[PDB]
Design a protein around this ligand. Structure first.
Ligand SMILES: Clc1cccc(Cl)c1N=C1NCCN1
Ligand SMILES: Clc1cccc(Cl)c1N=C1NCCN1
Lengths: 306, 306
């Protein structure tokens, strides 16, 4: 019993974190086999970041200018290339701690764990979600760039995020491990603002199921609804529209609890319309949307790794 | 920027988790040097747990009855002893992955990370606090017993909790690594109920400082208060009394922000008296008390490990 915002165990990623220094700048890189991945803005100075021409700035760089350090041990850089917004530094030693791994580009609403690092050193782990506006709400200070987001399935780390930028509103933007930004964001210090931070409806529903499984059930009501009626209310509250795909993925939690997906939607509708009146659900006073259906099953089941 | 419920990186503990089986029962143990620590109720059956005589049940056990497995590899048990509510199984191989470590008994209000495990395998990590009633609000299913709580300071893991019991109210109870329970709880399936879950006032204040550091400042007001006046309100809201020790430990956050501890107390007082009126602080609709002052400094600073 109990339901917690839970990150994946981070050891497998911890063994891949290194420090990358180019000139005056130091951030984190990810060492997988004989390649180190990091944000290409390592090559920029603070001034460069208003309008960088990365291809021109890169001309001035040679392998020996990228200082890569794994713990107290220096790695030899034998090649480098730019792929979209990441650098790939080829080193002469394969990381002996490389886990099984994959690079995934996730969809908005999907959750992942972040290992926050500074100077190649892990500082903490927490769970995040790719918001529908393609930001994440993280905890990143100067030097955390190159920290990564990831999921683990049995013994295989699926890397999905690399941290690059803090927007002036305090939210965060980054890339997949091929270096393509999530959303419209760019690695320049310019006027970029996040769109509407809509609520991830399927995740709220999943979390409500989690609550019922754990004895928080005061919000269950006598009502039901339809997809179209529920979405009229969702839209009004800046909730993502619920689709039949979404209903289907809630099927297993529906089956375990005996509460039809649309009956749960009617509970959510009343919560949106009447608030919580000072009550709590799973220790929260607002409706949590950073747990996916798979997350809820996983944690309510006890699936483990490696 | 950003402030998140953050656990310590878990790799160092992950390398210490093993599976312990005695008879029909399997839970987790902690392998440090040549000793494996686990809950002594591994030796009980489900029936035994109404009124176990551990000393008598142990007479029937020999080294070869405790099956200890590290990944796919069996460890040889060459001795065993009971220390309060934990077993210490001596094995013939020292864990090559033993980190630097200490056993600490923590005080209520102190926070720590938990690595939830099943069958010796890590499933997830999350941050917890030792409640003032000596429970923790965790996420533990059957087979998670022997999962541990810990803090990390530079390269040294301070183990402070081992998980043992779920109370009928869904909260959790456990021991330090010498096997003494936190609080009045016992390892028997009996009528034990948690006392009042009071709110950890110094932690709420710390978190409010964290909020100001990150731009959430709507709750700052024109008022101040005194320790005695604030505690009259704290008591009414089942908040722990604030002491001068507490004020002193908030000193550094006071200095960084320029907000006197007692002025912040006056903000907290108004929040307690008038609620939040549908607003949020650091993404929460209630007052978070599972971040210590040290936690807030740590995360707002970027301290790293090993
Ligand atoms: Cl397995 C592999 C794939 C691609 C490149 C290298 Cl160098 C590889 N070799 C190692 N990676 C981890 C230790 N050896
Ligand atoms: Cl360092 C120590 C302290 C106590 C007992 C043993 Cl067996 C020790 N040896 C090792 N622990 C980790 C690897 N070797």
């Amino acid at each position: 019993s109990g339901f917690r915002k839970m990150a994946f165990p981070s050891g497998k990623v911890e063994g891949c974190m290194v420090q990358v220094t180019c000139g005056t700048t130091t951030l984190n890189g990810l060492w997988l086999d004989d390649v180190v991945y990091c944000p290409r803005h390592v090559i920029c100075t603070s001034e460069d970041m208003l309008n960088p021409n990365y291809e021109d700035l890169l001309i001035r760089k040679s392998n020996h200018n990228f200082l890569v350090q794994a713990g107290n041990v220096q790695l030899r850089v034998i090649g480098h290339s730019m792929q979209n917004c990441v650098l790939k530094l080829k080193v002469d030693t394969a990381n002996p701690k490389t886990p099984k791994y994959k690079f995934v580009r996730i969809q908005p609403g999907q959750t992942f764990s972040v290992l926050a690092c500074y100077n190649g050193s892990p500082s903490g782990v927490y769970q995040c979600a790719m918001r529908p506006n393609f930001t994440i709400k993280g905890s990143f200070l100067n030097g955390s760039c190159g920290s990564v987001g990831f999921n683990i399935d049995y013994d295989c780390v699926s890397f999905c995020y690399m941290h690059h930028m803090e927007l002036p509103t305090g939210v965060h933007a980054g890339t997949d491990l091929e270096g393509n930004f999530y959303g419209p964001f760019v690695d320049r210090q310019t006027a970029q603002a996040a769109g509407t931070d809509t609520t991830i409806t399927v995740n709220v529903l999943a979390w409500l199921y989690a609550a019922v499984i754990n004895g928080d059930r005061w919000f269950l009501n006598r009502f039901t609804t339809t997809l179209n009626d529920f979405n009229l209310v969702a839209m009004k509250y800046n909730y993502e529209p619920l689709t039949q795909d979404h209903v289907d993925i809630l099927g297993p939690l529906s089956a375990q609890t005996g509460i039809a997906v649309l009956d749960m939607c009617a509970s959510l509708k009343e919560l949106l319309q009447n608030g919580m009146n000072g009550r709590t659900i799973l220790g929260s006073a607002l409706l949590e949307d950073e747990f996916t259906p798979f997350d809820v099953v996983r944690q309510c089941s006890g699936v483990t790794f490696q």
